[PDB]
From Swiss-Prot:
The gene is 43. GO terms for molecular function: 3'-5' exonuclease activity; DNA binding; DNA-directed DNA polymerase activity; metal ion binding; nucleotide binding. The lineage of its organism: Viruses, Duplodnaviria, Heunggongvirae, Uroviricota, Caudoviricetes. Residues 897-902 are annotated as: Interaction with the polymerase clamp. Mg(2+) 2 binds at residues 222, 327. Mg(2+) 1 binds at residues 114, 116, 327. Changing residue 621 to A: Drastic decrease in the efficiency of incorporation of dGMP. HAMAP family: DPOL_T4. This is DNA-directed DNA polymerase. Replicates the viral genomic DNA. This polymerase possesses two enzymatic activities: DNA synthesis (polymerase) and an exonucleolytic activity that degrades single-stranded DNA in the 3'- to 5'-direction for proofreading purpose.
Length: 902
DNA sequence: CGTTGAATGACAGCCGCG
DNA sequence: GCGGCTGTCATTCA
């Protein structure tokens, strides 16, 4: 096995790295790394190094890393560019590992932990740790063991031990139902005093120091707390042992509302799962508690329990510890799904960066590019600060609010990355500017062709067409690698079919699973001997067939992740290759594109229908366009279709056969018009929607920009068994919308699209009749609870106090007396409910923690003094109205038509 | 925290009005 | 009271 790195850090004049060596042994070494940078020199000084612009550069080998930056700042003082990799860790890595890293996740120690802390006087502050740490569950991927630490005596109680026999038992028997999978992997350890404990823990830590440190919210609590507790009880020098280099930094993160701090453990990679999840889950959630996120993906959350956590240790210390074990285990199961940890490992190494830098697009690319340009003896531009200037972005069409019966949408492929390639945009391929006519002039093709020599963007930029720029080259490489890997994947899929049938009726022989390369299919070299193989060979082989199957997935996805982040980085000032003009070129170019094709798609449906400038493209947002199909369905006659699937295939046919080509023809003219280095604008039919043939349903409708709904039957070719609702923007997607409502509205919409007004009306009349019977939380609202401070003058409403916050403060006004109440921290979400004026809370609204019941204390007061009328009205009716007006329908019989004017 | 630019829509507060 | 703006606070397409 080729050796790889685990972690790396720079402390003073040296590099501290942890890594696996040629023999799977984790070592750690200090290195007096001598960096190198560069400055522009005289061409007559024949060198082998050149910046991306072409100018010759001379290497500056430094004595140590201080001189490096001491020079970098000294160069900044003289006014001359200092080129090269300043993040010496990055360089160090490229240098120390110059080849493709192949790692063995099995040698990388990945710890996952959680701690419990009994506190009567409110939520325990991590930067204070005023209370004792009374439990710790710390799982380790190496040993595949859960190491538990139970405190038996604290100012808050003295308890028996935790019984694993009981923990295994069933709920109805008195157990905690800790899962059989982990029951043999637990390792209990009780202690007499906190000190006895922490000290053992701190000690167990060194015995098995983590490389990748994860767990839920462990970076803003578990770690900060444990660090500070130990510090307070033993002092900073004891706490710092928490770092394998005994170096820690109290990095202060001044949020956009207030502040809180996190501890930096040099020599460790903190990948807090909540954040890992938040970036790669791709889906907003009304709550990010491990509880909500666990039910959401495995059908079960954390252990349930009677009474408040505040007293769970005393009253039932048994559950309390099982609970702490189950929590560390939910995360482990979620990851068993998402693979986010693995993804990270993969990603980070492909780019040769500190694993946790994965959370950063700017840093991953900077790295990827650097290693590339390095391989070919080129030096990277020096980064430079630039005023943060806002530039234009995507083009969103103002949709005419209406219902649209048949819609067909096509989407441009990787628009932004693609544009960079076709126009060849890069800091060093800028050939120059050109007089610029209005954007519409270039959309109707009535504008003087920009340049007859260079590649062009509608914002006045011109790029060379001979040279292939650094940026586009790099995307194209990624773009290829992906198709490449997703090529080794589509392969294992065929061998998972050839081997699947080899188990329908296996033979009997003393054979071993043949050695092939599932990345590349079978021919005769091994496709032949697929019958004499025993029944034992056939099954162990298919275990080694799909093991790779996923291998591709991981790469193709990390590749897709990069493809998609690139623009963002390019648009970010802290980026090395950032450029305002290039940013605007990209953006402005797609503006032209999307609307140019709009013109083309509009002129082609007008011919094939002999119509008078009918506006076929009803809406388009960024890289896609929705087409009204009505006029097409009528050329054939809506009554000449055997059923639904009939007219769909019709459209699908028309799409591919006639339209796609009309488009490629178009985009090709445009590529010529701008004189780009390469035609890469490719659109694909995406969705096909309309109501169920024969029904009174309307099929779809638009409220306005970013707000519409469709009854789709076929997405990119995959036909559905039952129509599927694609709802965007509407409150049914609004995480802050009640649930009894995020439901109805949804039904309402569906009844609207496949049934029709008659339906909608009946439902509504019901959901309005039986409204007074819903579970308070079901009909409650949501939102982020920020700046709670800025508006609570004496605990009362001040100036411009939002509806949710001024509700939170009617809440404080209710829980001021019982500290066993759950005060709401700033940053998190909070449910809300109106109040039938003339009540206790002497106000308007009362809020509280999202995903949490409302305290018994004040729970049964609300549940009698809450306004339905005003609640129904504002969270269901108000928005429905907005819905049905656009679709031009009525949620309730006998209306006055005139009501739609002015 | 981490990586853009367009766009809704729930509310709080003035302003202009015999 | 009530319709426009302008302006925070929240969320979300692509």
């Amino acid at each position: 096995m080729k050796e790889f790195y685990l972690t790396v850090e720079q402390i003073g004049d040296s590099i501290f790295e942890r890594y696996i060596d040629s023999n799977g042994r984790e070592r750690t070494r200090e290195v007096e790394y001598k960096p190198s940078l560069f400055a522009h020199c005289p061409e007559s000084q024949a060198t082998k190094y050149f910046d991306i612009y072409g100018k010759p550069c001379t290497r500056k080998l430094f004595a140590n890393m201080r001189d490096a930056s001491q020079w970098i700042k000294r160069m900044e003082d003289i006014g001359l560019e200092a080129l090269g990799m300043d993040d010496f860790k990055l360089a160090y890595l490229s240098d120390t590992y110059n080849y493709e890293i192949k790692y063995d996740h099995t040698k990388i120690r990945v710890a996952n932990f959680d701690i419990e802390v009994t506190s009567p006087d409110g939520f325990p502050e991590p930067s204070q740790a005023k209370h004792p740490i009374d439990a710790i569950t710390h799982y380790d991927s190496i040993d595949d063991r859960f190491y538990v630490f139970d405190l038996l005596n604290s100012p808050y109680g003295n308890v028996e031990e935790w019984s694993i026999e009981i923990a295994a038992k069933l709920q109805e028997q008195g157990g905690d139902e800790v899962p059989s999978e982990i029951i043999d992997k637990i390792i209990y350890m009780p202690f007499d005093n906190e000190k006895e404990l922490l000290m053992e823990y701190l000690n167990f830590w060194q015995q098995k120091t983590p490389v990748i440190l994860t767990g839920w919210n462990v970076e803003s609590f578990a770690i900060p707390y444990v660090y500070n507790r130990i510090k307070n009880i033993f002092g900073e020098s004891t706490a710092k042992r928490l770092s394998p280099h005994r170096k820690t930094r109290v990095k202060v993160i001044e949020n956009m509302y207030g502040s809180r701090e996190i501890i930096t453990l040099f020599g460790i990679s903190v990948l807090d799962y909540i954040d890992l999840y938040k970036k790669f889950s791709f889906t907003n959630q009304p709550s990010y508690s491990l509880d909500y996120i666990s039910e959401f993906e495995l059908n079960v959350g954390k252990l349930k329990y009677d009474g408040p956590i505040s007293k769970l240790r005393e009253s039932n210390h048994q559950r309390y510890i099982s609970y702490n074990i189950i929590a560390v285990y939910r995360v482990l199961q979620i990851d068993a799904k998402r693979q986010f940890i693995n993804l990270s490992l993969d990603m980070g190494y492909y780019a040769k960066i500190q694993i946790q830098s994965v959370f950063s697009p700017i840093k991953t690319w900077d790295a990827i590019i650097f290693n590339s340009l390095k391989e070919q003896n080129k030096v990277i531009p020096q980064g430079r600060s630039h005023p943060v200037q806002p530039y234009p972005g995507a083009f969103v069409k103002e949709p005419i609010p209406n219902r649209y019966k048949y819609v067909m949408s096509f989407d441009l492929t990787s628009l932004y990355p693609s544009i960079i390639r076709q126009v060849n945009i890069s800091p060093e391929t800028i050939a120059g500017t050109f007089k610029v006519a209005p954007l519409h002039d270039y959309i109707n093709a009535v504008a003087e062709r920009p340049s007859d020599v260079y590649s062009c963007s509608p914002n006045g930029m011109m790029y060379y067409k001979d040279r292939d720029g650094v940026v586009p080259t790099e995307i194209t490489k990624v773009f290829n690698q992906r198709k490449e890997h997703k090529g080794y994947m589509l392969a294992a899929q065929r061998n998972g079919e050839i081997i699947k049938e080899a188990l329908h009726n296996p033979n009997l022989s003393v054979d071993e699973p043949l050695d092939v390369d599932y990345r590349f299919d079978f021919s005769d070299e091994i496709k032949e001997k697929i019958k004499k193989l025993s029944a034992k060979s056939l099954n162990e082989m298919l275990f080694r067939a799909q093991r790779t199957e996923v291998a591709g997935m991981t790469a193709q996805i990390n590749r897709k992740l990069l493809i998609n982040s690139l623009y963002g980085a390019l648009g970010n000032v802290w980026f090395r290759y950032y450029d305002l003009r290039n940013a605007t070129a990209i953006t402005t170019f797609g503006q032209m594109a999307l609307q140019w094709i709009e013109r083309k798609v509009n002129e082609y449906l007008n011919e094939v229908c002999g119509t008078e400038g009918e506006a076929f493209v009803l809406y388009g947002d960024t890289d896609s366009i929705y087409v009204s199909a009505d006029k097409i369905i009528d050329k054939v006659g809506e009554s000449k279709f055997r059923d639904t699937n009939h007219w769909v295939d019709f459209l699908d046919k028309f799409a591919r056969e006639r339209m796609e080509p009309a488009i490629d023809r178009g985009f090709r003219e445009m590529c010529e018009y701008m004189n780009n280095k390469q035609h890469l604008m490719f659109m694909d039919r995406e969705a096909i929607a309309g109501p169920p043939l024969g029904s009174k349903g309307i099929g779809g409708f638009w409220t306005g920009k970013k707000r519409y709904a469709l009854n789709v039957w076929d997405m990119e070719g995959t036909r559905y068994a039952e129509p599927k609702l694609k709802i965007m923007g509407l409150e049914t997607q609004k995480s802050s919308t009640p649930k009894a409502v995020q439901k109805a509205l949804k039904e309402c919409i569906r009844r609207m699209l496949q049934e029709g007004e008659e339906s909608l009306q009946e439902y509504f009349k019901e959901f309005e009749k039986e409204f007074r019977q819903l579970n308070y939380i079901s009909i409650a609202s949501v939102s982020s609870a920020n700046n709670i401070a800025k508006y609570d003058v004496g605990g009362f409403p001040g100036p411009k106090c939002p509806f949710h916050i001024r509700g939170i403060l009617t809440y404080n006004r209710a829980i001021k007396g019982n500290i066993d109440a759950p005060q709401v921290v700033e940053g998190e979400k909070v449910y809300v409910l109106p109040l039938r004026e003339g009540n206790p809370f002497g106000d308007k609204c009362i809020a509280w923690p999202s995903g949490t019941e409302i305290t018994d204390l004040i729970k049964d007061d609300v549940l009698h003094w809450m306004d339905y009328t005003v609640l129904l009205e504002k969270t269901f009716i108000k928005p429905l109205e907005g819905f049905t007006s656009a679709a031009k329908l009525d949620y309730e019989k006998k209306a006055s038509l005139f009501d739609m004017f002015d």
